[PDB]
Amino acid sequence: GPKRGAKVKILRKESYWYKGTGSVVAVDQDPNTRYPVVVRFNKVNYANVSTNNYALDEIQEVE
Amino acid sequence: MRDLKTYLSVAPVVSTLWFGALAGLLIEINRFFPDALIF
Amino acid sequence: WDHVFLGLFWMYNSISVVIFHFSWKMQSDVWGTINDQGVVTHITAGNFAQSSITINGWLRDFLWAQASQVIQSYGSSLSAYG
Amino acid sequence: GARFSNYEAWLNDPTHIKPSAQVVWPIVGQEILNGDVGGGFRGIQITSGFFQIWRASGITSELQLYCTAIGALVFAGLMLFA
Amino acid sequence: ALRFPRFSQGIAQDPTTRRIWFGIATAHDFESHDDITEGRLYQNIFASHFGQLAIIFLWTSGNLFHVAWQGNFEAWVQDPFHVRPIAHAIWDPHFGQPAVEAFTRGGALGPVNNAYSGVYQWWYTIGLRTNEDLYTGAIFLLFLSFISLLAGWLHLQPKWKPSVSWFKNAESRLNHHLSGLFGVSSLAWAGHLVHVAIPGSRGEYVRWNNFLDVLPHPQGLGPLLTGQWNLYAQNPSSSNHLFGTTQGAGTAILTILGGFHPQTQSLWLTDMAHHHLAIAFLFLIGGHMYRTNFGIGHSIKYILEAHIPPGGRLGRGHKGLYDTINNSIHFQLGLALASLGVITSLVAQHMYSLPAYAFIAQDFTTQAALYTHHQYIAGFIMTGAFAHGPIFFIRDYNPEQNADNVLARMLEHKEAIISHLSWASLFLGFHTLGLYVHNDVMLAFGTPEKQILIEPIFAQWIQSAHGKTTYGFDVLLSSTNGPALNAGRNIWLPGWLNAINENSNSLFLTIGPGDFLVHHAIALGLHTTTLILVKGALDARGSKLMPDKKDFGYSFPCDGPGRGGTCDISAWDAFYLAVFWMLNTIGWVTFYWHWKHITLWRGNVSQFNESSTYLMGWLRDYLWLNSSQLINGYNPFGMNSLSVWAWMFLFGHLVWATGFMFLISWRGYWQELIETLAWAHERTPLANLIRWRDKPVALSIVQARLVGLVHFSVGYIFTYAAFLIASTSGKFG
Amino acid sequence: TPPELDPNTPSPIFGGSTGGLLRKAQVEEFYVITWDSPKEQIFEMPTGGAAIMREGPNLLKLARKEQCLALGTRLRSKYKIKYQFYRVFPNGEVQYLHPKDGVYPEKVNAGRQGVGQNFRSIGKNVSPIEVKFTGKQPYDL
Amino acid sequence: SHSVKIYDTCIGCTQCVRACPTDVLEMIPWGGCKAKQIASAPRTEDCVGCKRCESACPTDFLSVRVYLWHETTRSMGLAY
Amino acid sequence: INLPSLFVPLVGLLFPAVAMASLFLHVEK
Amino acid sequence: DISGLTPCKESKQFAKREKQALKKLQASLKLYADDSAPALAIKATMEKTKKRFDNYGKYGLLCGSDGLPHLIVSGDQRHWGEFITPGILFLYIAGWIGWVGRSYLIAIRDEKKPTQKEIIIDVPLASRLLFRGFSWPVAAYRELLNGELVD
Ligand code: CLA
Ligand code: CLA
Ligand code: CLA
Ligand code: CLA
Ligand code: CLA
Ligand SMILES: CC1=C(/C=C/C(C)=C/C=C/C(C)=C/C=C/C=C(C)/C=C/C=C(C)/C=C/C2=C(C)CCCC2(C)C)C(C)(C)CCC1
Ligand code: SF4
C-alpha cells in the first residue's frame, strides 16, 4: 500500500471527501482488516469527523 | 492592547467600520453629485 | 422550545386581534369630533356594532377602508409608513 | 426633546400642534419626511407621549430637558461603572 | 392483505388511522403495490386511461346538457353582445329571498350562474345553434363515455389484454398517432369547419339530415383533385359580413387572410379550416417515418445510436436512450408533461391575443378566466413533469446501461447546472427587487422622475419586425422596402398588419418599463422554480449529505436529526417546495395579464403604465382598488350577486391560512396532544362505552407537507379566482 | 444460560398518576421491569412524577419497552443498580427481554449470531431498477 | 417493523448500541476490524426508527442504516 | 325547479351518506 | 425618437411635473418665515429640484407619455451613460472586490488555522492586498491564460 503521510485521492463514492485528497496515518497489516488505510482530512464532514478508514482500492496516491 | 487590536479586527467590528466608511463615502458623493441617473 | 416557538405565533394572533379590537372600537364608538350643542361625529361613525360581526366586515370596513392612509402616504411626510 | 423638537410651541398650543422630536438630514430626498407638525417646525411626528409627560412634570423650557438629559447620561455612566 | 388497502399488506397491518390515509394516497402508484408486474402495470394504466376518457366525455356531456336544459344559448346566439351566458340553474334551500332575487340574471325564471368557461362562443362558432343540437351532442358524448368504459373493461379481460411487448412498440404507435390521431383528426375537423361551421357562419343550417344534399362549394370537389386549389379561396367573406347571416358572406372555404373578422373580433373560419387542413397534411406525411410491418421506415434505436458526434464532447451521445425511455414510463410521462405544459401556456398566450371564437374577447371575464385557468394548469403540469423526472432517476435509471451518454454526463456536471441556475435566480432577484424598491422609494420621496425605467427595446423591436408601427423602428414587416414585406404583401399581410396596429385588441399590446420589470420578475420565477425542480431531480439518487438517497425512494420524511439535520431532503420535498414558487410565478404572470388587460378594457392604459413601476402601485391601484365591489358582495345593508365571490374570497383566505397551520407546526406536538386526548377518552364515563377500531395518531411528516400544500394551493386558486371574476364581471371592463 | 424468573415482588411507593397503563395493557401487551435497590430512595417516573423505590426487590409495570429501558438506564447510570425487563401478554405469558443473554449489548459476548449484517460497504448497494418487480430491497441482498 | 442494517465498514465503537432507546442493536464477535466486534440488529420488532444510532455512528458513510418500513403499534411508539 | 328539488338533496345528502357509510364499513373490515 | 419616445428637453409633461413639484414645495413654503430654517430647507429642495430636471434635460434623456425619463440599454451610442458606462464602472469595482477577497482567501489557505483569519481579519494582509484590485483585469487575464484561475 501507500506510505504514512502519503497524499491520497478518495475513490469511495459515498464519502464526504470523495474525489478529494487526504493524508495517510497508518495502514493495518492484519490481512483480515477490511479497511486498513487510515486517512485524515483537512475539512470535517457533516458529522464533525476528520478521519476515516478505507480499503486499498479506495485510495489513489497522487501528487 | 494587542488583544484590543485583535478585537477591532474581528468580523463584526471590521464590518461596522468598513460599511460605516462606505456609507459615509456614498453619502458625501450623493451630496456633491446628487440626483444622478446617468453615469 | 418548539412549544415556545408555536406559542409565539399564537401570541401574535391574540395580540393582533386585540389591538384591532381596540383600534376599531375607539375609532367607531369613542373618538371623533364634537360639534356645538353636543353633536358627536365619530371617526368611523359607529359602524362597529354592525360591521364587526362578520369576517367580511373586518376585511372591508376595517382593513380595506383604513389601509387607505398607509397606501396613499407616498409623496408626503407619512411616506416612510408606506 | 430639547434640541430637535417643537415642545415649547406645543406647550403654547397643545390642541393644534403635533408632537415632534425627530428631524432628518437633507439627502436623497428624505427631507420630505420632515413634515408640517406645527409650531413653525418641520419634522417627524412622535407618538411616544413624552410631551404630555413633560407637561405633567411641569417642564416648560428646553433647558430643563437638557439638564435631565445630562442627568440621565451621568446615571448611564454610573450604572455601567456599577 | 386481509383489509384495506388490499394492494398493500404493509399498510393493511397498520393499527392506526394512517392505514386509511396512505391507503387513499398510494392507490394510483401501481409500481409499489403488492405482487405487481410490468404486465399488470401497463394494463392497469391502459384501463385507467380509458376511465379518464370516460370521465372527460361525461363531463363535457354534463356541460352541454346543462347549457341546453337551463341556459340561454338561443337568446345568446340571437344577441351575443348583450346576453350573459348561463352555466346552470341553482337550487339551494339555504337561500333567502334577496339571494333568490339577486341571482336571477339573464332571461332566467330563477337563480342561475353566469358561465365564464366560454363554451357559448366556442359552440356557436363551430356551428351549434339550438338547444336540440346541444342535447344530441350530449347524448353522443355520453355514448362515447359508455364506449370508453366498455373499452377499459374489455381490454382488462384476458382475451383482450395486450402484452407488454405491444405497449413497447414505439414506432407503430408514433406512426399511428402522428398520421391518425393528429393527422386524420385535424383533417376531419377541417371537414367539420368546411361542411358545418363555415356555412353556419354564412347563415346556412347544415345538419346530418341534409349534409349530403348540400354543396360545401359552388363547384365542389373538382378543384381539389384538379389541382386548381386556388378556386377555394376565390371570394372570402366581406369586411362588412355579419356572423350567422348571409349578409356580406362569400363562398371561399380555404383562405390565408390573417387578422380578425371585424364584427366578431376573432379569426376567420376559412383561415382555421385551411390551417387544420395544412397541419393535417404535415402530420399525415410525417406519420410515415417509422418502420412497422412493411420493410421500410426508420428505426428509432438506430437513429439515436447514430447521433454521437466524433470528438466525444457528448460522450457516447444518445446510445441506449431508446431502451431507457421505452422501459421507463416515468421518463415518458416527464417528456409528455413537459411538452403538454409548454403547449398549454402556448394555448393561453395565443388564445388571449388571437381569439378564434366569435364574440369572445368582447367577454372580458371569460378571457381572464381562460388565461388564468390555462396558466395555472400549465404550472402544475410543469412541476409534475419535473416530478416524474426524478422518479425516473430513482426507480428506473440504470447507470451502467447509460454509460457516458447525455444522461449520465448530465448527472456528471450536476453541480455546474445547479450552481448556474442559482446564479441566474440570484441575479434576477437582486436586481428586480432592487429596481422595484428603488422606484418605490422615489415615489415615496415625491420624485418619480428619478425612477429607473428601462425600456423593453428588444421586445419592441420584435413587435416592429412583426409590423407594429408604434415604436417606429421600421424593421422587416415595418420597413416598406423589406423583401419579407414584399413576399407576403398580397397574402396575409394586409389583414395581419391591420390587426397588429389596431390598439384596441390584445394582438401584441404596447409595452413600457412596467412590462420590462414584471417580465424580469417572471424570468426570476421560471429560473428559481427550475432551480428547485432540477436540483431535486439531479440529487434524487444522492448527495454528499445523503449518498444513498436512492435506497429510500422518491418520498420519505427525512434521514434524521443527525449529520446536522436532514429535513426536506427527498426529491418529493423538492417538488413540494417548488410548488410554492410555481404558485408565486403564475401569480405574477396572471397579476400582470389581468391588470394590463383591465386597464386596457377600462380605456386608460396610462394607469398600468405609471403604477406598475413600483410595488405600492400594484398593491394600491391593482389589488386594493379592484376589490371594492368584491368585498361589497354582502354587507350590513344588503347583498347582491357578488356575495358568492366575497364568500369564496374569504373561503380562500381561510383555507390558505389553515395550510399555514399544517406547514408551520410539525408532528410531535400533535402526537403528544393526541396521546392526552386518548387518555381523556379512555377515562371518560359513558363515552368509555365507545371505542375506536383504528388508533388515533398525528398525521405523518410527509402527509403533513402534502395536506398543508393542498390547503395552500386551494386557498391560493379560489381566492384569486373569486377576485378575478368579481373584479372583472363587476364592471365588465 | 437460563433467563431470570419473574415472581410477584412489591412495587415502588407512588400516589398514582395519569401516565400509567391503558387498554393496550389489557388487550395487546404491557411490560415489567425489576431491580434490586440498596435502600429506600426517590426516583423520577418515566410516566411523570416522583416515586420511591423500596429496599430489596422492586417490580414496576410499564406500558412501553422504551419506558422500561429508559428507567433502567436511569437506574444503572444514576443509582448504579442492575435491572431486567420482560414483556407480558394478556393470556398470562411472559417474555424475557433485557438483557437478552445476561450481558449488556454494549459489550461484546460470544454466542450471538449476526442479524441483518451486509458484508459490503453501503455504497455498493444495487440501484432500485435491479430489484424492480421483485419483493427485494437493495439493502436486503 | 422498520429495517436496520449493518455494513462491514463498521469499526465496532459500540456507540449505536448504547444509543438505542428500545434495545434493538447489540455487539457480536468479528474479525474485520481492530475492535474485534461488529454491530447487529436482532430485535427490529422493537425498533421505533428514531435514528439515534445513525447520529451516533462515526464512519463515513454510515455503517448502520435505518430504512423506515412497515408501520406497527410498537414502531409508532404508541402506549395506547 | 321540479327535478332539482329531487336530485339536489339526493346527491347532496343521500348519496354522500350512502357512500360514507359504505366506505366506512369497507375500510373497517 | 427611439421607441416612439420624446426627448425630456422637449417633453411637455416633464415640464409640467417640474411645475407641479415646485408649486407643491412653494405651497408648503408659504407658512414659514423666509429667514427661518424650514424656509431655507424647502427653498433648498426647490433649487435642487429644478437643477435636477435641468440636468436630466441636458443629459439627453428620453421621456415617455408619463413625463418620466426612460432608459435605452440596447447599446445605442447616444445613451451609453444610461447603462454601458456605469455598467463598466460597476464591473470594474465588483471585479476589484471579488479579486481582492480571492487573494485574501488564497493567502491564508496555507496556514495552521485558516478559519481564524476568516473570523479575525488580518488587517495588514488585507491592506497589502487592497490595492492589487486596481489592476484586477490585467491580473486575472494573465492568470486565465496561465492556468492559475481554476483547478
Ligand atoms: C399525466 C398526469 C399524471 C399521472 C398519470 C401521474 C401519476 C402519478 N403520479 Mg404524478 N404528478 C402530476 C401528473 C401525473 N401524475 C402533476 C400534474 C404533478 C404536480 C402536482 C405530479 C406530482 C407528483 C408527486 C409529488 C407524486 C406523484 C406521484 C404519482 C404516482 C402516484 C399517484 C397517486 O397514487 O396519488 C394518490 C392520489 C391522491 C393522494 C389524491 C390527490 C388529490 C390531491 C391531494 C388534491 C386534492 C385537493 C382537492 C382538489 C381539494 C378540494 C377542493 C374543494 C374543497 C373546494 C402516479 C404514477 C407520486 C409517486 O408515486 O411518485 C413516486 C408522488 O409522490 N405525482
Ligand atoms: C417573499 C418571500 C420570499 C423571498 C424574498 C424569497 C427569496 C428567495 N428564495 Mg424563496 N421561498 C419562499 C419565499 C421567499 N423566498 C417560500 C414561501 C418558499 C416555500 C418554502 C420558498 C422556497 C425556496 C426554495 C426551495 C428556494 C428558494 C430560493 C430563494 C432565493 C432565490 C434567488 C434570488 O432571487 O436571490 C435574490 C435575493 C433575494 C430576493 C433576497 C433579498 C436579499 C436582500 C434584498 C439583500 C440584503 C438587503 C439588506 C442589506 C439587508 C439588511 C438586513 C439587516 C438586518 C442586516 C431568494 C433569496 C432559492 C435559492 O436559495 O436560490 C439560490 C431556492 O432554491 N426559496
Ligand atoms: C386560519 C387557519 C387556522 C385554523 C382554522 C386553525 C384551527 C385550529 N388550530 Mg391552528 N394553527 C394555525 C392556523 C389555523 N388553525 C397556524 C398558521 C399555526 C402555526 C402557528 C397553527 C398552530 C396551532 C397550534 C400550536 C394549535 C392549533 C390549534 C387549532 C385548533 C384550536 C381548537 C379550535 O378552536 O377548534 C374549532 C375549529 C375552528 C375554530 C375552525 C373552524 C371551524 C368551522 C367553522 C366549522 C365548520 C363546520 C363543519 C365542520 C363543516 C364541515 C363541512 C364538510 C363536511 C363539507 C383549531 C382546529 C390548537 C389545538 O389543536 O387545540 C385543541 C393548538 O394547540 N393550531
Ligand atoms: C358529469 C358532469 C356533471 C356535473 C358536474 C353536473 C352537475 C350538476 N347537475 Mg347534472 N347531469 C349530468 C352531468 C353533470 N351534472 C348528466 C350527463 C345528466 C343527464 C343524466 C345530468 C342530469 C341532471 C338532473 C336531472 C339534475 C342535475 C343537477 C346538477 C346540479 C346538482 C347536482 C345533482 O344533483 O345532479 C345529479 C346528476 C345526475 C343524477 C346524473 C349523473 C349520473 C352520471 C351518469 C354518473 C356520475 C357519477 C360521478 C362521476 C361520480 C363522482 C363521485 C365520485 C368521484 C366519488 C349540479 C350543477 C340538478 C340541477 O340541475 O339543479 C339545479 C338536477 O336536477 N343533473
Ligand atoms: C349539500 C346538500 C345539502 C342540502 C340539500 C341541505 C338542505 C338543507 N339544510 Mg343544510 N347543510 C349542509 C348540506 C345540505 N343541506 C352541509 C354540508 C352543512 C354544514 C356546512 C349544512 C348545515 C346546515 C345547518 C346548520 C342547517 C341546515 C339546514 C338545511 C335546510 C334548510 C333550511 C330550511 O328552511 O329547510 C326546512 C327544513 C325543515 C322544515 C326540516 C327538515 C326535516 C328533514 C327534511 C327531515 C329528513 C328526515 C330524514 C330521515 C333525513 C335523513 C337523510 C339521510 C338518511 C341521508 C335544508 C333541508 C337547516 C335545517 O336543517 O333546518 C331544520 C339548518 O338549520 N344545513
Ligand atoms: C427531470 C427529468 C426529465 C424532465 C425534464 C424536463 C421536464 C425538462 C423540461 C424541458 C422544457 C420545458 C423544455 C422547453 C424547451 C423549449 C424549447 C426548446 C423552445 C424552442 C423554441 C424555438 C426553437 C422557437 C423558435 C422560433 C421563434 C423563437 C420565433 C419564430 C418561430 C420559430 C419557430 C423560428 C426527463 C423526463 C426528460 C428525464 C430526466 C429527468
Ligand atoms: S432507530 Fe432508534 S430504535 Fe431503531 S435502532 Fe436505531 S436507535 Fe434503536
Short mmCIF file of N, CA and C and ligand atoms in Angstrom, two decimals, chain E residues 24-29 49 330 333 337 380-381 383-385 387-388 391 395 554-555 572 575 651 706 710 714 718, ligand 1:
data_model
loop_
_atom_site.label_atom_id
_atom_site.label_comp_id
_atom_site.label_asym_id
_atom_site.label_seq_id
_atom_site.Cartn_x
_atom_site.Cartn_y
_atom_site.Cartn_z
N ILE E 24 -55.51 5.61 0.71
CA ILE E 24 -56.05 6.51 -0.29
C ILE E 24 -54.94 7.16 -1.12
N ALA E 25 -53.80 7.41 -0.49
CA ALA E 25 -52.76 8.23 -1.11
C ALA E 25 -51.79 7.47 -2.00
N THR E 26 -51.83 6.14 -1.94
CA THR E 26 -50.90 5.33 -2.73
C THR E 26 -51.68 4.44 -3.70
N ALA E 27 -52.97 4.72 -3.84
CA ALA E 27 -53.87 3.90 -4.63
C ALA E 27 -53.51 3.86 -6.12
N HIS E 28 -52.88 4.92 -6.61
CA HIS E 28 -52.59 5.01 -8.04
C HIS E 28 -51.12 4.79 -8.36
N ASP E 29 -50.31 4.61 -7.32
CA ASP E 29 -48.90 4.29 -7.52
C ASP E 29 -48.73 2.79 -7.70
N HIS E 49 -56.54 4.95 -18.28
CA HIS E 49 -56.67 5.94 -19.34
C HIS E 49 -58.07 5.91 -19.93
N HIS E 330 -42.04 6.61 -16.44
CA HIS E 330 -41.85 7.91 -15.79
C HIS E 330 -41.10 8.91 -16.67
N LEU E 333 -43.67 10.00 -19.12
CA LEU E 333 -44.62 10.92 -18.51
C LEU E 333 -43.99 12.29 -18.28
N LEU E 337 -45.55 15.47 -20.03
CA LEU E 337 -45.99 16.58 -19.21
C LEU E 337 -45.24 17.88 -19.52
N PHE E 380 -48.81 23.68 -12.82
CA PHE E 380 -48.89 22.38 -12.15
C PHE E 380 -48.34 21.26 -13.04
N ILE E 381 -48.76 21.25 -14.29
CA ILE E 381 -48.29 20.26 -15.25
C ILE E 381 -46.76 20.29 -15.37
N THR E 383 -44.53 21.38 -13.01
CA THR E 383 -43.95 20.84 -11.78
C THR E 383 -44.03 19.31 -11.77
N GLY E 384 -45.15 18.79 -12.28
CA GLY E 384 -45.34 17.35 -12.40
C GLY E 384 -44.37 16.70 -13.36
N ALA E 385 -44.09 17.38 -14.47
CA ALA E 385 -43.11 16.90 -15.44
C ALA E 385 -41.78 16.73 -14.72
N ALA E 387 -41.40 16.31 -11.74
CA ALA E 387 -41.55 15.41 -10.60
C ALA E 387 -41.39 13.97 -11.05
N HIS E 388 -41.90 13.66 -12.24
CA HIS E 388 -41.72 12.34 -12.80
C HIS E 388 -40.35 12.21 -13.44
N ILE E 391 -38.35 10.64 -10.37
CA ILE E 391 -38.90 9.32 -10.10
C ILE E 391 -38.24 8.34 -11.05
N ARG E 395 -36.33 5.27 -9.55
CA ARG E 395 -36.94 3.95 -9.77
C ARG E 395 -36.43 3.19 -10.99
N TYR E 554 -38.60 7.93 -3.75
CA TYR E 554 -38.94 9.29 -4.13
C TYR E 554 -39.35 10.11 -2.91
N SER E 555 -40.21 9.53 -2.08
CA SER E 555 -40.74 10.23 -0.92
C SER E 555 -40.42 9.55 0.41
N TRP E 572 -39.17 14.39 -3.47
CA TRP E 572 -40.57 14.74 -3.27
C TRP E 572 -40.68 16.08 -2.56
N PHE E 575 -39.97 18.86 -4.90
CA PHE E 575 -41.20 19.17 -5.62
C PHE E 575 -42.11 20.06 -4.78
N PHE E 651 -63.24 32.42 1.88
CA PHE E 651 -63.04 30.97 1.92
C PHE E 651 -61.59 30.64 1.57
N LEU E 706 -47.94 17.44 2.47
CA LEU E 706 -48.90 17.33 1.37
C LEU E 706 -50.21 18.05 1.69
N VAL E 710 -51.74 21.37 -0.01
CA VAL E 710 -53.04 21.28 -0.65
C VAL E 710 -53.95 22.42 -0.19
N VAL E 714 -55.24 25.31 -2.79
CA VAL E 714 -56.68 25.52 -2.93
C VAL E 714 -57.06 26.94 -2.54
N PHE E 718 -58.66 29.54 -5.26
CA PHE E 718 -60.01 30.00 -5.00
C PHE E 718 -60.06 31.50 -4.72
C1 CLA J 1 -50.29 12.95 -16.70
C2 CLA J 1 -50.78 13.09 -15.49
C3 CLA J 1 -50.20 12.37 -14.32
C4 CLA J 1 -50.24 10.93 -13.98
C5 CLA J 1 -50.89 9.81 -14.72
C6 CLA J 1 -49.47 10.88 -12.72
C7 CLA J 1 -49.28 9.63 -11.96
C8 CLA J 1 -48.69 9.50 -10.77
N1 CLA J 1 -48.13 10.47 -10.03
MG1 CLA J 1 -47.84 12.42 -10.68
N2 CLA J 1 -47.78 14.47 -10.98
C9 CLA J 1 -48.52 15.05 -11.95
C10 CLA J 1 -49.13 14.39 -13.11
C11 CLA J 1 -49.41 12.95 -13.21
N3 CLA J 1 -49.02 12.06 -12.29
C12 CLA J 1 -48.74 16.51 -11.80
C13 CLA J 1 -49.52 17.43 -12.69
C14 CLA J 1 -48.00 16.81 -10.56
C15 CLA J 1 -47.85 18.15 -9.88
C16 CLA J 1 -48.94 18.19 -8.83
C17 CLA J 1 -47.44 15.49 -10.16
C18 CLA J 1 -46.62 15.42 -8.92
C19 CLA J 1 -46.50 14.13 -8.24
C20 CLA J 1 -45.85 13.88 -6.93
C21 CLA J 1 -45.14 14.69 -5.88
C22 CLA J 1 -46.06 12.41 -6.80
C23 CLA J 1 -46.74 12.00 -7.94
C24 CLA J 1 -46.99 10.55 -7.89
C25 CLA J 1 -47.71 9.86 -8.99
C26 CLA J 1 -47.96 8.38 -8.90
C27 CLA J 1 -48.94 8.07 -7.76
C28 CLA J 1 -50.18 8.96 -7.75
C29 CLA J 1 -51.08 8.64 -6.57
O1 CLA J 1 -51.28 7.49 -6.22
O2 CLA J 1 -51.72 9.71 -5.81
C30 CLA J 1 -52.82 9.41 -4.94
C31 CLA J 1 -53.91 10.45 -5.04
C32 CLA J 1 -54.08 11.36 -4.06
C33 CLA J 1 -53.16 11.36 -2.87
C34 CLA J 1 -55.17 12.39 -4.14
C35 CLA J 1 -54.75 13.60 -4.97
C36 CLA J 1 -55.62 14.82 -4.69
C37 CLA J 1 -54.74 15.99 -4.28
C38 CLA J 1 -54.12 15.73 -2.91
C39 CLA J 1 -55.52 17.30 -4.30
C40 CLA J 1 -56.95 17.16 -3.76
C41 CLA J 1 -57.47 18.50 -3.26
C42 CLA J 1 -58.91 18.76 -3.67
C43 CLA J 1 -59.00 19.13 -5.14
C44 CLA J 1 -59.48 19.88 -2.80
C45 CLA J 1 -61.00 20.01 -2.89
C46 CLA J 1 -61.41 21.45 -3.15
C47 CLA J 1 -62.76 21.78 -2.53
C48 CLA J 1 -62.76 21.50 -1.03
C49 CLA J 1 -63.17 23.22 -2.79
C50 CLA J 1 -48.66 8.11 -10.21
C51 CLA J 1 -47.71 7.29 -11.06
C52 CLA J 1 -46.42 10.02 -6.61
C53 CLA J 1 -45.42 8.91 -6.79
O3 CLA J 1 -45.76 7.75 -6.66
O4 CLA J 1 -44.03 9.18 -7.09
C54 CLA J 1 -43.08 8.12 -6.96
C55 CLA J 1 -45.84 11.21 -5.95
O5 CLA J 1 -45.24 11.20 -4.81
N4 CLA J 1 -47.05 12.97 -8.88
#
